[model samples]
Target: RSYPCDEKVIAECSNRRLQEVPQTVGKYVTELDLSDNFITHITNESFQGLQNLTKINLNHNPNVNGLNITDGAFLNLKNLRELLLEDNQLPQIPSGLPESLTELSLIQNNIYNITKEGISRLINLKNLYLAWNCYFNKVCEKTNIEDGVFETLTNLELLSLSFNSLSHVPPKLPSSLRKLFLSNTQIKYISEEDFKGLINLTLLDLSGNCPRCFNAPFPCVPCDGGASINIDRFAFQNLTQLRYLNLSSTSLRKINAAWFKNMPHLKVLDLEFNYLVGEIASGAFLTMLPRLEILDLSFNYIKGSYPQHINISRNFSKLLSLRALHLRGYVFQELREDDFQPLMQLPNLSTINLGINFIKQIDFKLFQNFSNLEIIYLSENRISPDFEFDPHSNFYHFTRPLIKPQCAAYGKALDLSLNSIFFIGPNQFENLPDIACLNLSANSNAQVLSGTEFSAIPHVKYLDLTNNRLDFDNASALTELSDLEVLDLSYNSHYFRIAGVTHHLEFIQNFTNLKVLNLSHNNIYTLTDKYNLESKSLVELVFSGNRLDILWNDDDNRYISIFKGLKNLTRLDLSLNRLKHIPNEAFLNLPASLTELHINDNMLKFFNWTLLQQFPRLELLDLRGNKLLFLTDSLSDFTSSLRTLLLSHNRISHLPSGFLSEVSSLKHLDLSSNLLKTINKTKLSMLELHGNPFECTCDIGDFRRWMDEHLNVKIPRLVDVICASPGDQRGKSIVSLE
Candidate 1:
């Protein structure tokens, strides 16, 4: 009958009649497995015969270490229910327990005292998992929780003492519990008569815990089996089978909707990362759960100016099975049309994340009822440029354009990156139909793009004319698009030309799945015009800047020596021009399948690092903004196989002791706006100095007093980037200006 008799059943008992059956073995046990091997003491001959056990598994044994559980160690196990004395180093809890224990798991054991007449003689106990066991001599007083230790589990449902050390809130609870996992020691709160007779609860996972601001909202008894309740609205109006809910990062600011309006079959809802402002009141979800679908108010503090019980148009479009809707508002200007006429009446809306607003005009029938909408995020907002409307501030008739959408071709993806579209005429993609991918790359188009404008955007492909204006066009010319592939014309015009790129460089030989072709910034001194260096599907060809002094110029007759016939160039940025260096055969006619060479913001002044260790496969050697004072005296054989090195804004002030020590794959380092002072080590982890100058002084007084006693990086605010001299002390602490 050898059931779970600890000490690995007295050291793996091979049944020799149950090795005296741990004294008895409850004659043909009901369940028993002595866990880990390390027994201690247990008397009554250790349950002389197990009197009909139900369940017992002494978990990871180590009992007598701190010793104490000696009295009858689980008396005869009269139909025991379930007991897995966890991680045992037992410390206490040993008396005579056998009221047929009902599910007890001493987690990580090291118990202290446990009473309610010793937890109510387990009268048909009901689920109790004592987590992490660290009783520390009682100290458990907070409130409620005494009802004869759960009135003998009158048919309890689920009760898990998550990492205990419970404080208050436990009282009345024998209406047959539903689910309660008191997470991580020290109960912060839980009321509403502590689930007054758990009517028939649904789901309630008080994630992690902490929040009983007492400001009241729950405890209002009147039940009828509707249990979807959450704690703290001060006594939640009798739960009512609360649908599904999670108050994300709770500190919930002024919520209203008459507070859950009686949870009528509520659907999913999470008020994410909150600090809610303007006290949203309005119909607040039509008096509660109007058949709510998914609704997450992502990161709040909503403001584009219409707070005060927000009605911004028909109390949230009457909700009829509302579809995913998250409009984290903060819009500054131009969105009007009843500010989303109640989300276009939500006809089962689709996805929408109008990133921080201040929209200026995107007019397309204002998203015509979203028609099963797809993604549309007008990135970070306030992206100016359409001009005109100033009907005089204060949102005066805010002339349309924040996406009007009507003559449909159905949504795909349109994110006006960081907005402020300088002037994009040429039919602006005649009403976007099946758009492929268009991120007006960090706008500010200071003009020019003519050439039949935008070839009627026939399913345009990837194109981010990086930075801007590759100018030369008179009215707006730069046409020539036969299904472009990846083309980011890096920084623009220092004076572009092909004599204005005649056929726009002959439309890249009909584009033909053209790979990547970045014309680095303009004034291209000469890659030597092979007209359009043939392309068996070109592969990356930057060009750095056009102030060129010589990427090569033996002047071989003409066409600038045709970059030695590009033979499928493989990445080349030429960095900032006006050269100053890099002429060891200056890439000697390059194209040996050139493998990445930005050359960073030019005028090289230093860092030869053996010309990128002689480019054998030359991974990447950016060089960031040159003129270094010292990069450990020019990179010493660079980072061996040099993966990537940017060097950030130049004027380097320090950094050469281990100047990247031995490169070590080098990764990415952009000393930011430069002038770095100190840096213990941790080498490049992709740092970007956020506009540097950290000269702090006293030799930077020990790294500015350990960066002013630690604060994870990002110093800024020296008067918003003002420190130019006085030995670089600068200013910045006016609350860090901007």
Candidate 2:
């Protein structure tokens, strides 16, 4: 199965239940994955001569109930160019497919109906996925798609009829379509000849057929007859090269400047969850999108003007190429100062999501002059304290009366996470000097963390003081963030050595250009080894949920050389610590450029394997929820550069004979919920034996003949690999045990 010797030989016969098709698969396979097999019928000599098959993934063969396709079934693959037939129950369009097919995935099929003479002879189809053809929520009974059914796909560029009950918008498509997904169909209107010859539609997704109402209640007001979605201001005047337009949720109520005056190269305009009620007319989309770059009118009840006022007939300063402006869940409360002077004329505005929104006071001049502003998402807002400082406010105004402020950072990523933001003054980020990634995480009253509170963003480089109450001592207020690189003081109340004051070994010797450090759920019980700690620029170290019960104290000054200078540590998360018995020289001071080691939910494990021969570039070893029971050694040393070995839910039940013959650069092997009944299937490439109940007689007949001859080994829950024991194939399914 696993072909890969370059020049096209693919053959990755998927989820093998292959009821047919394999007659010796390899004939110079040009990509042939009999997808999630149970192959029911496809005669015309099924794939007789192969003739250099070019792409064929019979996607999720949902059991053999319906794949009978016999009219010249693909008459000897005439260089078949991609045909996926997703989730099967396939009912149509299978007559002699390959017109040199170009990408065709009939997603979740029950193919009730589809016409224009049932796919007017592909014409070299270019990406057409009839999405979710039926069943799920039921309605799409007769799929229906007929108007000049894509006028012979004139080289269709991308057409997905999502969900499908298509109430409209099905004209002579294919104006060389460029991405058009009729989302959850039943579309209500979209007229203008439903986009007359698309004019090369560039991404248009009519999201989810809306229709829901609560006539009136706590400000419900979405006045529009059921399932709204009208849109016909010349329904996109022949889409002048429309660039991404998604009418999210679809019950769209307002905002129509001729539905974007002929999209002047529109750049992403999603009307979020549409129930949009009023206030967005002034120069509707700043005079028909001036090269709009992402503008999602989030949630929507869009009515402005509270204690604020600046809809000078709405002119988001003529969307000067706006860069990400999603007015999150618009239940916005009070936002004055000329309500964001038209987003300071968005000179390339960079990410501004007023998250969740009920935004109580935020007018540090709504973030002063934006020099290419970079991310300012005020998380789930009600950021309180009742602000009101406008003494000719230029900027710097926190309320509840403290005027003692300056923090006007010019964002390079600033998400005042969650936000209740209680006192953070120490020149609170003194005019934030181009702060680089600063998310005052969760902000649980931001419990005192002022050792010069980020001494004015000294080039702060990714700092998310997680769930804060920052009981600091040796993070000595993050030694002036000396160009810090990724530091998340995890769920902080910081007590890593509080009494005998080790302060996370003086916060890792004052962050020597730290590189990723997250002291997880911090209640860090103990880790002081007289602070002889050193660091060659630590690379990822997260002490998962802490109570570190003397990390298996094998005294050499306790836990010998506790990470003696994490010499370029490469990922080390001691999962939910209090490790039961790990001291085989407790990772001899780790760092042989350690490569990913998450000791999962630690309780005990038996893999001292000489402390993994001190990580020779170990590649991933997450001992998931440990209590291991087998593996008394022999992993053939590190099995060559171990590649992902997460013993899922560990309670191992077997595996010792040549323990996978020296792995051979193992490729992802998560022994799903252990206590296994059998194992051996090497040449790995993804093998996750569902929660192992294995054992189906004849000693698993050589692991079901090595899972039916490889089929490119990807045993993802191999059909929930059942049959715990033979009492008549216990629960069946090791592919229905023989």
Candidate 3:
């Protein structure tokens, strides 16, 4: 029996229970994958005739260590270019690896040492990965690499030695290396001559080597020898072609621009989660980054007022090519114009994120250039609607800065979410013009709907007022925005806390042009016996994450008459509502024009398919995360147009054979995390059966052969398809048996 092979002469034999290589493989196969198998050894006769092979994968076969392989095992593979042999207990590099090899990876092995002669022969080797050799931050055994071991491999492009206990960098690395991954090691000091000849290096990751010392309270101590990482003045000397550098979480106490003068092409520099405090106020790092476009300095500490402490704009005259800046959680006090006045010197700047700074006040003229800005986020600042107050004004009534009239450019959306703004007073939004999107989500104590509040901004089309413990005074607070299309008021308005009674939703009809409305997660416990949601322009509604289980009135037809007036609705979501059962005869109350429905996480024990056949154009239905034990009506046929059906995380033991026999238009079917003995798949673009409790004695062997022998159908995550019963084969891969 031969494993699967494609037209490109690539054999896919991974996870197959093979004791040795296939003797009947084709002569033209260029690649062979024998990974994750039970193979014990290999000899010269294994791949005797496959000389055209360019790659060989022997990964995850812990039985094939360096001693199990004979000296001439891979000698016949003279044209092999790449060899992957990870997760094996190799004592050393295999002896007879071909000299034509260009890439080699021996990760997670037991090699305690790299001898001089073991690697000094392969001069043409280009990439090497020897990480996690039973060591990360601390080693099981002392691991060491021979000096000048990588000097002969002049063509090497990537050298990865992270996750080891190497006390320092190995001496004399090849200058051709382009990326060095030395993260998670115990190296203490970075001297001036650490990277001497590696000028072509473009990306370097040196994070997690030295644990940061915040001095607050933690378990881990300081760096290696009770001192911080000692970085010389010229640690990174002359790496001219370096483009991206990462030194985060390195316990660096100061920052200097003189050390990076040689790296003129540096584009992105990440120095987050360090202890660089007052050195940032000097602003010496800006003048040297002429071509720098992105800079991230988040989660550092910056305190005090704008006039004396955080005036970082003193040296911001350079960096004309800056585009995006992130200063989140800097904890600055006041925000004035000259504090960020140096930003006007940049022509390519577009994004500015100033969230979580506990900024108490703001002068409206601080953003006097909003017409040219793209996005401005001032969230969690606690600034009120009176944004015109200037704290530094000697004459409060006479002084006002220049204000930008319109934020009408490229999606210049304002994000004021997660603030404590409680008031929405009159003429609050008249100063700003031509704004389209406003996000006010997750505000604390936000009474959002007052009379004449939104009458000043009629051009506002998309509004997000979700997650506000919303207080509403006027039912017509949203009637002025006739052009509004999208509104998300989910997670708002608890009936007991706000109104102490059932909250009426008669104001929903005022959005005459609304298309998408999300009202999920509001604890509306009242069930109106007679409610008419009359909206002709509404197309989609998300009413999930609420208690819809109380919508049942056993005496009358309250469920059928609630949604009768929605004329053109297409999609309705009712997931996570804890619905146990619906009236079997009255479940067909939705519009016939609807195309998609979601009822996942409802714990529906009984299913009724006869009422679902009402919609002739339904395409997708999500019924995942339910407690369905059986179908009440299995003889009913679903709508023929249904293409995607989700039934994951249910307790279905068996499905009727005719349940999906005629669904030829179905492209995706999810039966994952269910209770099933056996299942099948065909004519499906996607199929999921990962978490089923399969009994793989005789009932599943037929389907296994049908899939393994056909080779055209593919199942994702097949590694989890283990036999759950038959004690002899329990916890074994289903496809690994006869």
Candidate 4:
């Protein structure tokens, strides 16, 4: 098959049983795929006259080692730019590669040697991906690289040699190379001359490899198990342009300022999951990297459990460009105020992540000097259960002493989620009125929140209190957040009482600007007009997995009518609510802008099709996992704009003739796992009729005829739609019966 267009042609001859390249392919074809085939040899005559061919994919060719390609096989195709030979049986690199190739993928092959003479012709190569060669246990093969093989590829910017048995970094890399990936290799340590001339290299990854070199006699695997890696102090001194470095999971005992004295342009440094046992030297980063922006030191053991003040020595007074600092998983029971005094005054710093720790106390003024701080992650920490703050002091009091005129416009977000915070003092966040998003989810012990606490962030727009122990008393706290847009109060039913609460949305109705609200996985029994918000800005609402057996107690129409005021609602999810039935006019009050309705996993047996007429923009209607008896009594005018209709996993036996008569825009129709036997294919993009016992007879003749003619419509499992009746065609596929 071929896609013949004016500018280019795409030919696909993959998996054909041919033994050689087909000469019938178009000369103008720029891309060809012959993967998963049995053809082997590739000579200069393979693609003799295809001068415009730029890409050729011959991966997974059924040959002993891949294919035999002689020298100058691609000498005629000077315009070729990309070559894919992955997952082949090749034992050596193919010769006569096009010098114009810029991207080459030779992954998962059996090649063991990469020589200079084989690849030196491709001087314009930029990206070379050769990972996972000799990978499996029984087929483990060693890959040897000849020195100076990559020196001629002067413009090479990225090189990947991971998942191999190479013992060291390849020497004589081009000075223009920027990124090098050497993970999961046999490399032990880097010698002083390994990166001698490659001063322009910027990004380096050395993860999942043994970084320490051990003396012999004992096996190196057992000898270097979690041992400290040795490094020459001047190893990275000349690479002044290096900005990002990852050294995670590489055991290291300590680091001093000399290790990074020459790396002034470094911005991101990762040293997570290591065994750094000693205290950080003072001014380790302040005197070395003046332009550092991000520093990650998570999962390291550099903390002391003693009560006495232990100088952690992480002073960064001169890092004026610092923006983010992550120090997660440091098992320190106590922290002194001066331990991080230098970090308190940084002007440009914004994010601080100190999660997964045992620190119980924190100075309220710890973030005093952060002028534009937006996010603070303190999850999975040992915060005091009954934490209380001095009412006289707040987040603003500390920063106000050195406040600028533009400070109030900076604090937009904060995260204190997943902590054991049992109590919160009122007005604890009163100083942070500019914060728009706050996450306090998964704090099971936080049982109550007062209006005073809600007034802390008066302009807050998004609030997440999911998986907490909040109750009706906390409902009153939301009354002050009228500007809130998104609110999640899910999974907190054990603290709610049904006896005293008069309405489910007693507290939710206060958000005038709320656009999205999630009350899923709760113990709510019914939905009522009292849950309606004052604003028409609501766009999406989710109440799935709730105990809503009824929409209203007194009048269903009147309760649903409250949604008519919400003129902007677009999506609503009410699945898994076990609703047996609803009034025909239950959705008559929905907004005309409603587009998606998800009511799956319910006990719904029927629905009024006329109710959908109110929503002219409705596109997706899902009723999967229900007890639907039929799709609709007749086609409604609302089907004009509907695109996707899912009725799968139900007891639907039939669809009324002309049920989709006006559905011109319908693209995906699913009737799988139903009592449907046959369906006449229509103008649909995709259709599913599997798991149904379709009878093989003349009654299914129109469907079979449609399947044969309409190749544009995709019918999943067409061959598996076997015969259920008619003795002559019993056990035969429906397609065969045609």
TM-score of 3: 0.76
Query: Tens digits of per-residue lDDT for model 4 on 1-738?
Result: 121111227776676555687676788888988777777888999998688898998877764346877887987888999888877767778887889999888877777799876788899999987776743253666788997899899999888786677878898899878888775566767677777877887887765465322322212242155565555777887877888877655666666578787788888777766654353444454567678898776666543442323245455667678897777766666655567777767788877777777667665445544666776666676765511222122211122312122321334566667777665667356344267777777877444554666675677778878888665554476767878778888887664435455344556555668888887887776433364443467788887877556554334434555455557788888798787876555557666788998989989888787677777888999989989887675545546777898989999887777654445788888888899776654457877886787777788988777666766776665434567777787666576653
lDDT per prediction?
Answer: 0.54, 0.68, 0.69, 0.69
The better-scoring model by TM-score among 3 and 4 is: 3
TM-score of each: 0.28, 0.37, 0.76, 0.76
> Model 2, range 578-623, lDDT digits (tens) per residue?
6776655556666678888888988876667656765778888888
Better of 1 and 3 by lDDT: 3
Rank by TM-score, highest first. Answer: 3, 4, 2, 1
Q: Which model scores highest in TM-score?
A: 3
lDDT digits (tens) for residues 302-374 of candidate 3: 3343332245645555777677676766676677766787786678776677777777666545565532556
Question: Residue 154 of model 1: what lDDT?
Answer: 83
Point out where model 1 deviates above 4 Å: 1-244, 247-259, 262-268, 271-294, 297-324, 327-340, 344-351, 354-363, 367-738
TM-score for model 1? 0.28
**C-alpha positional error of residue 412 in candidate 3 after TM-score superposition, expressed in Å:** 2.2
Task: For residues 1-738, write the lDDT of model 1, one tens digit per residue.
Answer: 112331222223221212222443435655666555455555556655655656766665542363235555676656677877776656555667777777877665556455565566666766776654533233433222345577666866666554445565466556666555554334445565766666555444342233322222322221123122234664546666766655543445556565576667767666644444443334354446678777666445443354322235256667667676665553445564445666776666665666654556555446654556555657666555512222112110122433324211223556676677676765555555455455666676766565566666655456666776555434224435555566666666543544435223444544666677777666665332333355666777776666456434444334333444556667767776766665555445556666777777676675545545545676676777777666665564543555566677678777766564455665555566777644544333443554664544344445445445444333332223333334535643211211
Question: Counting only residues 3 or more apart in sequence or on different chains, how many pairs clash (N, Cα, C under 3 Å) in candidate 4?
Answer: 3
The candidate, 1 or 4, that scores higher on lDDT is 4
Q: For residue 325, what is the lDDT in candidate 3?
A: 70
Positional deviation of residue 256's Cα in model 4 after best superposition, in angstroms: 5.2
